[PDB]
Design a protein around this ligand. Structure first.
Ligand SMILES: NC(=O)c1ccc[n+]([C@@H]2O[C@H](COP(=O)([O-])OP(=O)(O)OC[C@H]3O[C@@H](n4cnc5c(N)ncnc54)[C@H](OP(=O)(O)O)[C@@H]3O)[C@@H](O)[C@H]2O)c1
Ligand SMILES: NC(=O)c1ccc[n+]([C@@H]2O[C@H](COP(=O)([O-])OP(=O)(O)OC[C@H]3O[C@@H](n4cnc5c(N)ncnc54)[C@H](OP(=O)(O)O)[C@@H]3O)[C@@H](O)[C@H]2O)c1
Ligand SMILES: NC(=O)c1ccc[n+]([C@@H]2O[C@H](COP(=O)([O-])OP(=O)(O)OC[C@H]3O[C@@H](n4cnc5c(N)ncnc54)[C@H](OP(=O)(O)O)[C@@H]3O)[C@@H](O)[C@H]2O)c1
Ligand SMILES: NC(=O)c1ccc[n+]([C@@H]2O[C@H](COP(=O)([O-])OP(=O)(O)OC[C@H]3O[C@@H](n4cnc5c(N)ncnc54)[C@H](OP(=O)(O)O)[C@@H]3O)[C@@H](O)[C@H]2O)c1
Ligand SMILES: NC(=O)c1ccc[n+]([C@@H]2O[C@H](COP(=O)([O-])OP(=O)(O)OC[C@H]3O[C@@H](n4cnc5c(N)ncnc54)[C@H](OP(=O)(O)O)[C@@H]3O)[C@@H](O)[C@H]2O)c1
Lengths: 331, 331, 331, 331, 331
């Protein structure tokens, strides 16, 4: 396993981050536990989850599944850098009761306690804002996070779905009063969606945040979804983001040229998409979303893959990116 | 003439900013002087220029044309908020001698003295960085600008062609030591190019910066370029940014839709493109680029236009924007 | 003559401040100079003026009258604490040209140089904001005033017509970065108008500001205006603030009881109104507004007067005050 | 017993520091307890240990031996300034699992709780970084240590095996936000290795850190290891740093001239090496590493020794040092 | 010519720095002027000098030689980053009159004015402390430098012959109050003397200082001095640092190994020693000290040299370095 520092901080993480969103609604508990043990066996020490994972009536299920995994012993908790999230409504889906979503100090207090209980642990290593909350100012947010740091309930704070200027404002505010700022940003970044290159990744690099890419396969769309389109099973690529893209002709053409490109070179689409993120400057790693143990082993092979300059140049022509602002739209 | 504060600061400006880029390479000194006289007569108090305007061997020409205008007296200098720019290479076009472009304290010192000399004035009201310089840190930049403030050579500092996160870093750094930060950002923003909406204008709004939109007509492309395409004269729409667009079938189709829409509503294309910027949240105003006194009078009418909701919705249809990050590309 | 520190600072001032607003529009130059000579002879070392004094086409005349008085030599400038003001429109009466009124760094730059030219002096001791400007933030204002301090063009900064919370925000902002804040507030305070007791004077006292009361006779209303009502001449009491009040039966009765009370006690109404202000806690002193040299001598006698508890109690009955907020309107 | 302040802080310490590295792997529990009772009887109030001491499969053993010593009662814990360390891998020897070594907030949290449990105490008086960790920034480190300070788990923070500029950076960062910085540096310093004089000790003295010298006899080499080379026993000088130095004829000769010089002066080599350290400016004292009660008594005699200038000169000729940078290598 | 940023700041400099110490005592004025024109022609934009250069009764002569060079016109001053130095005694050689050497605010004021006059310029781009002054505190030094920055007499401040911890203390102190810190350290660093690697270069790199190496050929010792040993000319290698080294058998043996090695590879000793420094991480460049225009051309060739791994390995065996502290002397 390749390791790296999480941005500027002293925390060392595997360059594959184990995502757990499938655990519960797509992968059942026993298989979820098998994936996590396999992940630890391959040297992955960085697990991402969220309080909302499980979905609908089953929100919190994923954190519970991790909690029973930890309760097996064997230094599982001690070996894992455990990350979860606050922002989402944990009540009935639909409009939330006021302050039962977003980032008020009130919702931060109640959300972290509920996550700690479900996870069966006295601390979260990386507590992440699931999304920017424009209505909560940074002196309120850092007040609340600092309470948790001092109480030993969290170690580090991270962001997710921030704009680049939110990262700058957050960490400048933290720095003025001696607080450790955001240590990482979890943003949507993959071959199909590269606009985090404009400002999110540049701001993260300047401020020394790790960068971890969620939906690195665009929800399975980059996993060989065309070749597999008629297959059954409970596959994520049959729904949501991937199925939406495949209905659209120009995006379908993109994935078709992508799967054709990799047929020529004899490479696997899921593995190449992960390996491609590992080449992008500033990227700590993809957050892999295995549904099965074989998909985890596939991600592990993806981390050992070297893409040639030919393949990298060809991917760039199929999936151009904007580069940074202001050059991306001005000069 | 409608006035507004420039973002959060005490300076009041006309919502039309007079751009001077045409003065010299496209508009001669005599017509330039008349345009500026008409600008003052119409209540426009805010002029934008740059050291490099003039182009090629005539870099600095524009500042000199403004200087001979001020030298005529009549309270012209006292009435005008004078903005200019540093970053550009003022030597022979091509690779600059080291530190003769960009934002080192060395180049700021020599550039500001050259501009004051050409402009024939002892102070610049708004001194702007022409572009982000990723290699100069903000404590060096704010040191150099603070020397100029305390010497009385400049009043305010502004940015141009920044990323949103550069605005945040700049003003947070300035605030740690009680310096007035950036007061305005001058960015490309018009019907044709709306990606400043993702992060640049959001960051400017959070930090209380004015937002002044350069090339509000995309270089004359939105001024009725199709209807005018076969005309003679020294037209900006006949070259550069506008000519390249009218070559691409889809960008041309976009502009054809625009010109056809406005013919059904009795509106002029250049006036609508300016009036549209004036409706955008956080926009101080467009930096108009008249080539003729007639075109300046047209802009003054544009500032009095009220666009109906039907025209605004139709324009959104032809010229969609991305809105803010992270929603623009994630959720 | 009684001297006191101006609030918390080391400057020592006479408890009578010489107001000059009459000098020009009401008192001619010759007698203006006479009043100033007699003021200095009585030990008054603190003169208040403004760039706009003179009024209409003659704005700046008062400063020019002071200029020619200092020009006579005699250690006059060295012996006087010279205070003037920035904010007002120095152009034609009516809507001002943008940034030719208010408190932008731009208007501060141009106003102080024109005041120094008219006064014939290289520095102003106390440079006062004529009025709060809600559109200019304090980091911009303190930037501009710091330039003046460091250039030696001013010594101290004071306010006029501020709200109490403006005084707090201004001096907290200055203190943050090691600037000396406002040293004095010049507010309307007299027997007829006591609402400065609510917040302005409490905030001034908390922050250690001098308090100097403008129109201490309410524009002559408290100077015997009813007794003198039928006399001709260009008396201030005939017009403006005093005229309006006397046309109101409720306020006219107040003044009638006032003048009758002091007739019974053998006291002069002008002198009593000044002595009253000198008893108020936090008040440095009144800014007297003599129209004649006799009225100046009267002010000097007011500063030697001791008002009995009986007279003070009776004045309180005729001219009740609100006291401080929140008690003034809540509990 | 001579006492001194630990650098600039209020803590008073014996100029002999009791090192505990031998307790467990070299000296058994009952003899270790005997030495610690004798240390206290001698007035030594300052004990140094580490989580890793005990070595190999027995890491943590030394802390347990001190824990059983404290558990005897008798005001032993109340009388002792207890120092331990964080940084070392406490797992199986080899490369550590990520974040189970070094100075991340994660490893600091897990290491201190493990040490407190082994030591059987609720607080550590001096918690030391065992080595600089170049990948962890000082705002992460000080956040972590400040959590422990505010929870009462530690009192002071110290460093060990730092460069001089690490000390400066650490304490400047601490001071910015009012944290007490490093109070001591534990560095390798003895007659054989004097390069801490170049920058480590000068930086410590500038920032007012104590300087406590580890391996003061260079692992037993300066304790008469030539004369005793044929001796048997679990001797430290028979292995490690000392045995290496004697395999090398070039420094073997240095030890020979040293043992010869002290033969002539009737002095004990172990005692002289400690007494020499007590003469060095800025040195709090040496960390003695007795294997036996008798070597502790010998160290106590060493602290009462007076080395004549004759001997100091001769020692400085056998064992020259570089003095401070930049003079040590430039001018 | 290769260019690089000077550490973290926006200043771009040639990776060859032209040293001027030879100009005067070794190279006469005419050929000094020729070398400087040749340097500019080659694209070298960064000149180093000092007030004392000239030596003895001719101290200041080197600055005058640069002054007459600038006075020729030709954009010479505008194109050059001009560095000079303060600390040295400018009076009669011997013990200095108090405050006529070292870094008191008093000596800094008088030294900079003398240097500006001799240089014939109104500003120094990079004003450097010639040596650490342990007796002057950093708030005194930064006050003096800030006076010069705000007066426009200097732009940047640099250090020379500092210890690593001095760099840290200097820049932390500067940053506390918004001052730009040291931008560069000028230290002795070459194949013969590598102890700047222990702590000076690491501190410089951490704090983002440029590193410019003085006497990069060890005063000519590395320029072929054994092969040239019996030659005439006013050769720097015939005296001083290089001559004393060739006296010592161990040191002479090292240079012999060097020259013999390069004969086997068809490389020149002066050029290799320069090219070697350009490979060292964190080194901005060597400060070349040509005696002739031919030696300047040879340095320019050295900047285009690529040293093979074989040669770099062989040089490291001849000229081992200590690497960073604490590992250099501890672990
Ligand atoms: N911060 C946020 O807003 C956010 C949002 C979403 C996710 N996340 C995090 O990012 C993690 C991953 O997101 P994701 O599940 O959407 O990632 P993804 O990799 O885009 O999608 C997962 C799907 O890709 C396929 N796949 C996975 N590994 C593969 C492989 N080695 N080869 C071929 N196909 C493979 C599987 O598709 P099939 O099922 O069709 O076989 C799998 O269910 C989540 O677990 C969560 O921790 C964060
Ligand atoms: N900060 C930067 O990087 C940057 C870059 C560019 C410009 N600027 C600034 O922004 C200012 C404006 O830039 P620009 O000149 O490109 O503006 P623009 O308005 O996009 O282009 C100017 C052209 O639009 C046409 N036009 C202007 N006013 C019109 C009207 N009322 N009705 C119809 N057509 C009209 C004319 O084209 P025809 O000649 O074809 O008639 C005119 O020459 C410049 O003067 C400069 O100050 C800044
Ligand atoms: N900061 C602001 O916004 C502001 C506003 C107004 C004034 N000020 C300052 O405050 C100063 C005083 O204002 P003001 O002129 O309105 O003062 P005032 O004392 O309220 O009114 C002046 C008039 O009162 C009469 N008077 C003056 N002294 C007298 C005395 N000893 N006995 C009897 N009557 C006397 C005269 O009225 P008759 O002519 O009827 O005899 C005189 O013209 C001004 O000079 C100016 O410096 C500041
Ligand atoms: N921070 C770090 O990196 C680090 C590293 C090492 C140590 N330390 C600390 O520094 C302490 C001392 O280290 P150390 O054990 O290596 O010290 P040391 O004094 O250099 O070596 C100990 C050995 O010196 C001999 N000795 C001790 N006292 C003597 C005396 N009075 N007369 C003659 N010989 C004597 C004994 O050797 P024989 O057994 O051969 O008789 C003893 O085992 C440790 O206990 C530990 O607390 C810290
Ligand atoms: N901050 C300080 O304390 C300090 C101290 C000293 C110097 N400096 C600065 O560092 C600069 C350089 O120092 P330095 O003069 O001692 O440099 P140096 O390069 O170590 O010594 C100069 C000598 O090396 C020889 N040489 C130079 N270039 C050569 C080449 N391309 N090929 C072969 N030989 C070459 C010449 O020796 P021969 O004459 O024998 O031919 C020349 O006189 C000085 O000018 C000064 O700016 C600073």
């Amino acid at each position: 396993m390749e390791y790296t520092q999480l941005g500027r901080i002293g925390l060392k993480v595997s360059r594959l981050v184990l995502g757990t969103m499938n655990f519960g609604p797509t992968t059942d508990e026993a298989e979820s536990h098998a994936i996590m043990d396999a992940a630890l066996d391959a040297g992955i020490n960085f697990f991402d989850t969220a309080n909302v994972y499980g979905w609908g009536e089953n929100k919190g299920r994923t954190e519970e599944i991790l909690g029973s995994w930890f309760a097996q012993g064997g230094d599982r908790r001690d070996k894992v850098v455990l990350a979860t999230k606050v922002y989402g409504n944990m009540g009935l889906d639909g409009p939330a009761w006021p302050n039962h979503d977003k980032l008020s100090a009130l919702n931060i207090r109640r959300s972290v306690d509920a996550s700690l209980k479900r996870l069966g642990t006295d601390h979260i290593d990386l507590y992440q804002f699931h999304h920017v909350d424009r209505d909560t100012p940074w002196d309120e947010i850092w007040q609340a996070m600092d309470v948790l740091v001092r109480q030993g309930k969290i170690l580090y704070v991270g962001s997710s779905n921030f704009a680049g200027w939110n990262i700058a404002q957050a960490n400048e505010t933290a720095a003025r009063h001696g607080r450790l700022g955001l240590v990482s940003e979890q943003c949507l970044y993959n071959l199909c969606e590269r606009r985090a290159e404009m400002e999110v990744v540049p701001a993260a690099r300047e401020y020394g945040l790790g960068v971890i890419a969620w939906s690195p396969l665009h929800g399975g769309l980059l996993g060989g979804a065309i070749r597999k389109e008629q297959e059954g099973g409970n596959r994520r690529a049959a729904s949501g983001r991937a199925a939406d893209a495949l209905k659209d002709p120009q995006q379908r053409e993109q994935i078709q040229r992508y799967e054709d490109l990799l047929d020529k070179h004899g490479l696997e689409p899921g593995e190449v998409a992960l390996a491609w993120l590992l080449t992008r400057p500033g990227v700590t790693g993809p957050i892999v979303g295995p549904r099965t143990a074989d998909q985890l082993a596939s991600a592990v092979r993806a981390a050992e893959l070297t893409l040639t300059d030919e393949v990298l140049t060809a991917l760039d022509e199929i999936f151009p990116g904007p580069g940074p602002s202001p050059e991306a739209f001005a000069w």
